[model samples]
Target chain A: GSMTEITFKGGPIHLKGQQINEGDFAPDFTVLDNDLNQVTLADYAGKKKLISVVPSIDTGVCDQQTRKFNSDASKEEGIVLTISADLPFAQKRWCASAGLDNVITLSDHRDLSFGENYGVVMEELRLLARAVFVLDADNKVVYKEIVSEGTDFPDFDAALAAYKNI
Target chain B: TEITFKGGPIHLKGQQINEGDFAPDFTVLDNDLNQVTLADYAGKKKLISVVPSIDTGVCDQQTRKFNSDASKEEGIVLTISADLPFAQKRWCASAGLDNVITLSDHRDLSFGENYGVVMEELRLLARAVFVLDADNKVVYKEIVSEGTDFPDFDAALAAYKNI
Candidate 1:
């Protein structure tokens, strides 16, 4: 009774069911990249996308996993943007320090709309739960992972395999 | 680390430490760039107040009260937080609490796991308190069940008496 029940990757944990997912168009929003350029989902509308949401750069799993995707993303022909609520400066410093250029790091410090729309809000922790979403051309959700548990890798291979068919 | 039906993608329940256990030794940087540890306060009673950040209100109150109490106590009161050393110094200065010491564990969260107060769900350090005797034994330990709750001050002080 003390905990809030919310669906993570699937299986009825506690979700509103209307969140963006397979066959749904991710809401369009602008975010600042490490280079300080404004970017939106529309920029990659006709391509593929991998959205990684994490709590902060002060931790390990989130940043390391984001790097992993950046390296592996060469298999697909799209950009992968790692999103977090940390300030743009923090994200930029971490990315630049690691020499991670394969993917883009973005910040949502301005609002919680992205977290709420993606259904990755961690109510008790007051941070965004770690998860990944793969979208295809036209912005339809081709693959999605709520990351039911913390620190686990989303079904990356599964998501890519499906994207191949799409 | 198997996944449980718990909150995060990784099921990592923090290591639990209690009173009477030997406090783990960890290193933190002092303002002068000198390395300090739990052993540095050997032969003196020690108070380690752990918080996510000292910039916040509740954390600020704890550090300030301890700073005031440090004058009368024989041991040093060290505030362990994830804040940068500059911010920690700034917080102490603005509060005018010079008697307390602030150390940061921002690098890899070594202190959080060593003390078992890391909140995996939120990726923040849980607000906890530990009082240790001169022998480096934990004489008092309290990890607030709720992140928002204040630790039991009376219970912690009672342990201070034992030291």
Candidate 2:
């Protein structure tokens, strides 16, 4: 029932969920992988994680956001999970065409379970607002950035630095 | 749960639409990501084909059939799916479908909820079909009871032809 205000196209939109912060423990979430298999927070247990949240992967902005994360993640040894409202079919199709081997696309299209748990769901648009979360091997929230402007990108340099330093 | 997919029952949410009811307006997105509504198709008859996903087996079977049928006349058919507009556009591009307009109900679930085809368990639309006359009155409707099966395309087409 909690509402947090963000902007889409410079206008206001409300997201419904409890917004987690940098110091909080990452909550367990359920989403679907490219294959529609149930993916949970515990599925990547013992691995460091960088969760990149995008509203739609097909949009130009979100498209680059995903690729940048993918490129940055290419040298890493952890999971770069790109979450979105796009169906698993689209995610699979996009990943295949984009030729991204490091990033894994997961879908919240079923119920937005991960979106709700992460407090990124833009209820009005039924899409996730752009955000980034970095977690350590122990699942500590090492970094969190919920972009205020919908069209803007997350601070990739800053978040990537957090992912690196953590 | 009102429909079965892969031999398991799934729930359908939202109001029940009937044949005699006035076709209500809905919010969806077109291939270019433009916001679209039923009101936009005002002066034309409609053959609304609802599917769970666009690129999948049964849905493709339905779409390709209607796409083929639509070209024989001065016709336009609306295909509804929970797939994003990008996905629908990509599918149309690959399938070389021109006469069928694929709309994404993923944004607001407006079309899915308004037509009572929302498959709640999967957050996808149940396989269904509806036909509307030029004035947008519901002349025919079929909420497919089996989620994995195709709707009665022949019957729906017949209704469209008669309407």
Candidate 3:
């Protein structure tokens, strides 16, 4: 008789595999900043916005990814938002260290409601898969990309092209 | 202040026990939902394994492994992390680890900030391990250096045994 394999401490995380593709209306979400204040997509309405949501700032990939977005895209008009699950104090410290003033860094620690509302939760990892959603003047997704595999970066040039065309 | 463990870069000085310093006092929520202060473990040797969350992979393994080893000794083994009570309960139930005392520092990040294990950029605790004497003075400490890497469990245990 074959012995049953014992389940380990943390069982496998069941991921929600729904892919929220491009052109879909980005769901509206209200997240808290480091100071414990609420912020929403409505706060940046009437301006082009690029929202980059990442898992945590501890990982070098996530940090580098955030820095790339901040340095590369901050000059564009409208409000540039970078979201993560890190605490507000940590976000503030990271911003101060990186000299990142042009972008607004927000935290979703209240609950990953932003991630759930957007359908990007990696259930097993309990982290947000790397994602980017660009909104035009009307808040419609001009471009959206969910890195099917997280380790890869999004199509930045293509996203820039789509943004420029908008 | 920064120690580079295998996982990545982490700040060492800001965590719970600085190099060669005694372990700091912390209010850990016990498995029974009562508070266990550092003073409670005074005089007996203590092995503290600090992790980011029990729900993660490393934390659970360390807790159970340490608990089994702790059963053989007269020392106290306290597993500290930012896991909420409910989640901590789930992990403990699944692993059958009631023998090891599990404590949470999720509420105000008090234990995290004081221990210096709080990952600022991440706003969570870093992985660290500390061994202290009954006097609450630290005898050995390790800031995992990489938030993802496991602490040097063998080295910590050896230090505790020697002391």
Candidate 4:
């Protein structure tokens, strides 16, 4: 078990769970898709996964973050899953309005299961902090970036490249 | 303490509320992500519409009915749910409804548990309607027996109108 640090709008805040380290097997956590289907890490077994987490998809930074990741990782081997505290309803709307095809939207709003398990839950704000994670086929955490600032964008090429190298 | 959803039993978590009971104070969020409390509506009759999710068919109907009914009404109608403000705003915008206000209980589940409308199994609110008097007393309370069904709109609005 491990924990990390970050800031929200320049104010200090605490995270709920242990941070994932490189080489550690990713833990399974429950989340919901746009259709309200229960999903877990195991659901993406045998494939590389690049996870992009944002506080809320309704925000501008979060929108561009996911839009870029989805467009960039389309040719990648594994799928791209974007997690957010937004409900499945909002996620579904955002995906439809954006006309996104290659990326999958997962809602952590039900329980914050993925938020807490991944050590990104911004408890004070009841949201997830900005971050990115890349997991290899065997479920090992190959690359992780918990963006220091809540409003800042994550390293796009860094995460995609991490997936490519694996 | 419990309700049914699509023929399945679901337990409700929170203190049960009665008709004459004082409405409990709860912290919820509006579309702008600002904290809204029960005291905010101090001197007005409140017709609070509680639903599980805004996107679902029944919930949508329930809210829209109240939305239309609230047109130029004396009391204010507030729709509270476990949905984040983002979802609530989107639903309200798409529906083009302005009469009923949308409040989010997603952050704290404060309104859900305090009002005894929380479905423990899904961590969502059971379909319900609550009408509070100007003094904040619960004048009418109905937790939809079948969680997926609609609440008694006529009785609730009548109580709201009477108060």
Clashing pairs in 4: none
lDDT of 2 at A82: 91
- Report clash pairs, candidate 2: none
Rank ordering of all candidates by TM-score, starting from the highest: 4, 2, 3, 1
Residue-by-residue lDDT tens digits, candidate 4, B45-145: 88899998887778899988887776444767888998878778777778876656899999778998898888887778889998998899998899888
Error of 4 at B75 (Å): 2.1
For residues A38-155, could you state the per-residue lDDT of candidate 3 as single tens digits?
8888888788887787765655566787877666764556656778665555566567667866557887765666777777666644556677888887888878776655665667
Query: Model 1 chain B: which ten-residue window has the lowest total lDDT?
Result: B1-10
- The best candidate by DockQ is 2
How accurate is chain B of model 3, given as a TM-score from 0 to 1? 0.85
RMSD of 3: 13.9
A14-112 per-residue lDDT for model 4 (tens digits): 888777787888888999988878999889889999899998888889999988888888555788889988878778878888877556999988788
Tell me how far the alpha carbon of residue B6 in candidate 4 is from the true structure, in angstroms, after superposition. Answer: 2.3
| Overall lDDT per candidate, in order of appearance | 0.66, 0.85, 0.68, 0.85
DockQ of prediction 3: 0.05
The digit string of per-residue lDDT tens for model 2 on A41-111 reads: 99999888989999889788999998898788644578888999999888887877888655689999888
User: Candidate 3, after superposition: displacement of residue A23 in Å?
Assistant: 2.0
Which ranges in model 4 have alpha carbons more than 4 Å from their true place?
A: A1-4, B71-73, B97-99
lDDT for model 2 comes to 0.85
Task: Report per-candidate DockQ.
Answer: 0.04, 0.59, 0.05, 0.55
Model 1 ranges with Cα > 4 A deviation: A1-166, B1-14, B70-73
In the range B38-126, model 1's lDDT, one tens digit per residue, is: 77777888878887567566777877776675534567778887564545655566667666789976544567788877656434566
